């Protein structure tokens, strides 16, 4: 549960958002379970956002898509019922992030889980 | 004094014996100031006036107390 207030406090101050990774690794056991990573923030941070793109925080997602768990991000942005919300603005940012995401290629999962990644696709 | 003569000169030379009358008025003012008597600053004068007021108050209090204690026959 601490992860939500943690990323809140992260946003609460104007961090460099790349040094943010240091605080993230510190606040967590650094390898306990990355299934509670940035994957869910994109949802919850946008939850109260609604009719707003919520900028200055997507930078975290940008600095994360370099090397993170792309599978969880993929499945959660797929299951995200955002077009139902019909904001017509946030969906644009979703297109932008998916551009940098899928244009070149996906990444390896070093296990059969990567196959499920394809499923999310 | 200063402003009167200044305004007179300004209104006269903007485009007879004014200086003589000004000097006469200044000499009269100096004579009146010296005739007053108070040469030193008014600080010591006010100090002496306060001392005299205190002395007068003491004298009035003594004269009042003198008419109170009347126990003779």
């Amino acid at each position: 549960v601490n992860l939500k207030q943690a990323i809140l406090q992260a946003w609460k101050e104007r961090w460099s958002d790349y040094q943010w990774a240091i605080n993230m690794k510190k606040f967590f056991p650094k390898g306990a379970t990355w299934d509670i990573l940035n994957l869910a923030e994109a949802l919850l941070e946008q939850a109260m956002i609604g009719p707003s793109p919520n900028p200055l925080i997507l930078s975290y997602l940008k600095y994360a898509i370099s090397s993170q768990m792309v599978s969880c991000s993929s499945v959660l942005t797929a299951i995200s019922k955002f077009d139902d919300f019909s904001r017509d603005l946030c969906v644009q940012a979703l297109l932008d992030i998916m551009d940098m995401f899928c244009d070149r290629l996906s990444c390896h999962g070093k296990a059969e889980e990567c196959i499920g990644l394809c499923r999310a696709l | 004094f200063l402003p009167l003569v200044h305004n007179v000169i300004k209104c006269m030379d903007k485009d007879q014996d004014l200086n003589a009358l000004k000097t006469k008025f200044q000499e009269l003012r100096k004579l009146i100031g010296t005739m007053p008597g108070i040469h030193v600053s008014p600080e010591q004068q006010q100090q002496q006036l306060h001392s005299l007021r205190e002395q007068v108050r003491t004298k009035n209090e003594l004269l009042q107390k003198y008419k109170s204690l009347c126990m003779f026959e």
Binding site: P53 | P3, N19
Partner: protein
């Protein structure tokens, strides 16, 4: 360093009883250097011939042919400057507009407005436009004021929705020492007490530019040769409430409506688009300063109280709150859906035109200024950092034009709290919001929205939401 050369050696070399021969024997012989002779009003008491002599001296220095029958009374040779306090142009006027202001002890509004209006009536015209066109424009710039006064009198409901807000009508007499007036500002905040209008004497259903804040509009120009009327025509009473501006006729009037914009409030492209379709081209021909509009405008507005010490806020707006401290941001340098940053209009170009299709040219500007004020309210003089408690920073995100929004992690719930604050009307802003299917109920009803609207302050509204909606 010393003053021993004033009364010690000057009186002996001032070249007595026989030393007054300097009026006929030694007489064989200023603007800002020798003010001794110029400042005659200071060496002596303010009298009638003193100022009359100073004005004549200044006129002879600058150059102005003028005289009178004798010394003691002299008018001003102009279009309508002829006025005695306490026909070659206009008629003999004896209104109080030039006698009331200088009744008993006026000594300020006598050498500024006159010289200003004199310098205003200057152009390349030689006896064809310096006097003819100037007087023509001065006469024409009265029908609009008369119509505004008639409309204000007709709008006999309240001097809050028609005088200040809604439309124009907070005007004053436009003659000589006073130009046209209007309630450009829309200050919804009162003084250090209740908003008691009519301070001691003010009751004329006019509301001049003295009680609070109001602009000063005039009609002058030098190269604005625009097609418009040359005389005041529309002055008759309308059928029921009001009427339009019927002209005719129309000539190349070489003037404009350059008002006196006090603060360079930033405007939107919509204002320039509307102005470029009212009298030909826009009201300004220069490089548009497309810098951060809200950022610079907030600083410009708050620069009144600021002292010579530098601010260096850098998008920091820490301030107080109903019972604690808090913070705030401005969402600056954030490219909205508009693409580029908000265009800035921090200038004093208030050169309007004749009263054509301008029924809402002020309402949009009023809403823009109100949004700017609501934004800058958070940062006026509050400087308090390292606040461990509270510090509820929020960023006003103006995504759409004149549509702001502020999201903050309200302590009421364990998540963020966003609220749409859009300026729908000129004084009735939109304070609705869109919640989510899975979110805590820290969002109040329309009651808190109306309370925030009545407050019209960002930090006050934030504190209210944090206190009224929480209630725990």
């Amino acid at each position: 360093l010393s003053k021993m050369s004033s009364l010690l050696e000057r009186l002996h070399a001032k070249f007595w009883s026989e030393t007054i021969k300097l009026v006929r024997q030694v007489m064989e012989k200023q603007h800002l250097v020798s003010c001794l002779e110029t400042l005659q009003k200071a060496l002596k008491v303010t009298s009638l011939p003193a100022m009359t002599d100073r004005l004549e001296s200044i006129a002879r220095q600058n150059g102005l042919g003028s005289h009178l029958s004798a010394s003691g009374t002299e008018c001003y040779i102009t279009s309508d400057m002829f006025y005695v306090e306490v026909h070659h142009g206009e008629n003999p006027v004896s209104c109080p507009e030039l006698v009331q202001q200088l009744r008993e002890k006026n000594f300020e509004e006598f050498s500024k407005h006159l010289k200003g209006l004199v310098n205003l009536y200057n152009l390349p015209g030689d006896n064809k436009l310096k006097t003819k066109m100037y007087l023509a424009l001065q006469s024409l710039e009265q029908d609009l004021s008369k119509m505004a006064i008639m409309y204000w009198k007709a709008t006999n409901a309240a001097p809050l929705d028609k005088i200040l807000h809604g439309s124009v009508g907070y005007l004053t007499p436009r003659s000589g020492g006073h130009l046209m007036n209007m309630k450009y500002y829309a200050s919804p905040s009162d003084l250090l007490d209740d908003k008691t209008a009519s301070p001691i004497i003010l009751h004329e259903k006019n509301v001049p530019r003295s009680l609070g804040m109001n602009a000063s509009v005039t009609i002058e120009g030098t190269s604005a040769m625009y097609k418009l009327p040359i005389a005041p025509l529309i002055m008759g009473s309308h059928p029921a409430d009001n009427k339009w501006t019927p002209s005719f006729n129309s000539v190349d009037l070489p003037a404009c409506f350059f008002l006196k914009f006090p603060q360079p409030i930033p405007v939107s492209k919509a204002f320039v688009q509307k102005l470029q379709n009212c009298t030909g081209i826009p009201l300004f021909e220069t490089p548009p300063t497309y810098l951060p509009l809200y950022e610079l405008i907030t600083q410009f507005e708050l620069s009144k109280d600021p002292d010579p010490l530098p601010l260096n806020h850098n998008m920091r707006f820490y301030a107080a709150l109903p019972g604690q401290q808090h913070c705030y941001f401005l969402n600056k340098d954030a490219p909205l859906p508009d693409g580029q940053s908000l265009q800035g209009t921090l200038v004093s170009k208030i050169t309007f035109q004749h009263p054509g299709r301008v029924p809402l040219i002020l309402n949009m500007i009023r809403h823009q200024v109100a949004y700017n004020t609501l934004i800058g309210s958070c940062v006026k003089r509050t400087i308090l950092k390292e606040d461990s408690p509270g510090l509820l920073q929020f960023e006003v995100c103006p995504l759409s034009e004149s549509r702001f929004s502020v999201s903050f992690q309200h302590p009421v719930n364990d998540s963020l709290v966003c609220v749409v604050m859009d300026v729908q009307d000129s004084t009735h802003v939109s304070c609705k919001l869109y919640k989510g299917l899975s979110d805590a109920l820290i969002c109040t009803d329309d009651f808190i929205a109306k309370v925030v609207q009545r407050c019209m302050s960002i930090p006050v509204t934030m504190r209210a939401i944090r206190r009224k909606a929480e209630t725990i």
